[PDB]
Amino acid sequence: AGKPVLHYFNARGRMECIRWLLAAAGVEFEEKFIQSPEDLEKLKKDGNLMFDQVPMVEIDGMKLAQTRAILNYIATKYDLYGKDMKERALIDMYSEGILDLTEMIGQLVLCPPDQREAKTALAKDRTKNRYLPAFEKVLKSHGQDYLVGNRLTRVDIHLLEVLLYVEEFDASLLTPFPLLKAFKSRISSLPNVKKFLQPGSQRKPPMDAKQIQEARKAFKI
Amino acid sequence: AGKPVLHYFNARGRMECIRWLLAAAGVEFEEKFIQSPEDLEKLKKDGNLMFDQVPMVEIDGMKLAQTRAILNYIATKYDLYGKDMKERALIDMYSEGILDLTEMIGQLVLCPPDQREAKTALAKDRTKNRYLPAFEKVLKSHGQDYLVGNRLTRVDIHLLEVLLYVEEFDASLLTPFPLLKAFKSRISSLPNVKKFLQPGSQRKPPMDAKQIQEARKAFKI
């Protein structure tokens, strides 16, 4: 095969971080969108999904499922996983923290009006007092342009991506962090990244209250 | 330093998969248990926890947090991560499915009482119709003793461990799967595993009801 094929709904979800990593690596990919329960059913019946779930990416002869397994394979393949196990330990701990932040904010648009109020307050609290400070500290610790090993790795991309989501959430959360503001602007200028950020790329938008309801009355939800 | 130091509550939680990997690898470790919230607070205040969370393991000079980061580092260090990136893709995909299954069962203990029965029936349904069939198939596909690469890897250990929890959950779920029954017995006989399974090892038991709430009437949440 030529281009990796990404199987997922036409939405951000768990596949967006993979789109970002391939984009950053400069690797062109195709997407086969799951538009209906029938598309999903067919994917399962034809033996495409190990645990009957997506994300699933066809690459180098594999039908690879599980977000993290896919990200790990792609980062290794395109030299975005650092130079050794020690740098990989830092890249992994940092990336896992970013995934947790992403989920904590991402779950909000699901909270029952009686729950969201406090959950949002907790997320903003965690964002400005737990996560942003941790990454601002990493940058401050070595004063280098990238998070690990003074060279671009997958986690610089994951961090840029989640900062964008933090900005969509509450732009003010980011103000106390000068080093993250600089980092965000630096990574966004990389050629491959700038191209993904441009209108018309395969980058996905966030989903508005209604929009989602559809997807519920679109599949099991 | 010397032995790895594991920072966690005196319970299974997210640290158990890590205790299991080190035991299988024949690596001796120490544990510093978090007995009270005052214990946890100190760990945070002293800056040893990147995101003020545990599991955290002191190994090779690092204060490594995030379960998956720790597991990936330990697996690579002790040659339990396969031989190449393709093997690691399968290892990762399989392990993520195991982690998902583990969480699905484990979280039941936290369900609001009015949701627990529905949640439990789903977890049982997923266990017998999605996860166990998927792993039985991997073993049947190549007919070999191990899941990946015809050689012991971290995921063989992850699978033995989650098979034990499935047995605790509902032993009847495991009866229709012959190759998994055989796999379980086989991995259980390896020297280092048999020793971890024996009484008096650092392996952890499930928490009981009173214990679950008591641990609640103990910390925050």
Ligand SMILES: N[C@@H](CCC(=O)N[C@@H](CS)C(=O)NCC(=O)O)C(=O)O
């Ligand atoms: N831990 C898996 C979770 C995947 C997952 O939950 N996929 C959902 C949509 S996000 C799915 O495909 N559900 C269909 C089904 O369970 O039948 C991963 O990160 O890839």
Ligand SMILES: N[C@@H](CCC(=O)N[C@@H](CS)C(=O)NCC(=O)O)C(=O)O
């Ligand atoms: N995604 C993290 C989750 C860590 C986590 O939730 N740790 C909990 C106990 S299992 C904690 O330390 N909570 C204390 C706090 O949030 O203040 C990991 O896998 O290591």
